DNA sequence: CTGGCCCTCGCTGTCAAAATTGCGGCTGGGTGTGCGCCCCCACCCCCTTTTATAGCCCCCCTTC
């Protein structure tokens, strides 16, 4: 978190990864958004079928 | 026997809904993963006594 790049490279993690990625099992595993429909909010379609 | 009319009823067309199968072609990577409850029946363990052994540990007592 407040590592510096110094303190990153002596740690063996490269100052300019973003971050914001998991690792499970060793995988850097990332969660991509999922849009879905805005809730608590009336909408009124246009069902023709 | 013949003919005019309205009736229950038999059958049909028509509309509608539920049910049904398919949705391009090749390819290359990587990465992961594999009941349930409540009851009845056999079998085994602990209840107890004895005694030696010693480290460990609970409990009560005592100190200040």
Redesign the pocket.
């Given at each position: 978190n407040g590592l510096t790049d110094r303190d990153l490279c002596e740690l063996n993690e490269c100052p300019l990864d973003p971050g914001g990625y998991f690792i499970?099992?060793?995988?850097e595993?990332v969660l991509i958004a999922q849009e879905k429909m805005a809730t608590n909010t009336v909408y009124v379609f246009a069902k023709k079928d």
């Open positions: 499970i099992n060793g995988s595993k």
